[PDB]
Amino acid sequence: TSVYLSELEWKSASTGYGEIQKDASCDGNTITLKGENGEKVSYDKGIGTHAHSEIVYSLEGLDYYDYFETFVGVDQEMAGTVASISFEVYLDNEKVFDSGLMTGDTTQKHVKVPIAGKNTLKLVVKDGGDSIGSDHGSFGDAKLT
Numbered sequence: 790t791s792v793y794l795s796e797l798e799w800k801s802a803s804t805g806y807g808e809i810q811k812d813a814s815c816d817g818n819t820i821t822l823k824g825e826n827g828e829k830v831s832y833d834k835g836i837g838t839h840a841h842s843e844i845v846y847s848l849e850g851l852d853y854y855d856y857f858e859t860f861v862g863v864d865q866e867m868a869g870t871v872a873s874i875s876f877e878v879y880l881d882n883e884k885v886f887d888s889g890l891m892t893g894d895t896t897q898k899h900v901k902v903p904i905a906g907k908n909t910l911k912l913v914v915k916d917g918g919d920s921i922g923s924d925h926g927s928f929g930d931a932k933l934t
């Protein structure tokens with residue numbers, strides 16, 4: 790029914806600080822994002838990364854799936870910091886999602902884009918236009934469905 794991105798191997802990957810963490814935040818904690826009702830939300834699966842980050846996945850041999858789905862936001866390990874980022878999703882060189890500026894307490898966003906007839910998925914986490922300081926971006930429950 791679904792395959793998580795952390796169960797797949799990227800073609801290429803980069804991160805601005807530390808290393809990309811599969812099923813964990815940048816600092817190796819459970820991925821947490823700010824909920825819509827004041828809560829801290831935990832995600833068992835996903836990708837923890839840091840601005841500036843770019844990750845590219847091939848969708849070859851994955852024709853079973855209709856959508857790419859993920860939550861995005863500043864990882865809540867960095868709550869109450871200078872954290873400021875944006876998330877961009879690309880499918881075949883076309884931008885299909887842009888989060889805009891997200892800071893420490895910005896409510897998580899919920900991505901769902903159709904992947905039929907698509908070959909390449911690209912994830913971008915940018916630095917909010919100031920610096921990469923505190924810029925822990927997490928992709929919560931990142932999967933193909």
Ligand SMILES: CO[C@@H]1O[C@H](CO)[C@H](O)[C@H](O)[C@H]1O
Binds near residue numbers: 806921925
């Ligand atoms: C001075 O703040 C630090 O900035 C770094 C990026 O340069 C990382 O985000 C660290 O987690 C953060 O604590």
Ligand SMILES: [Ca+2]
Binds near residue numbers: 921922
């Ligand atoms: Ca920033």
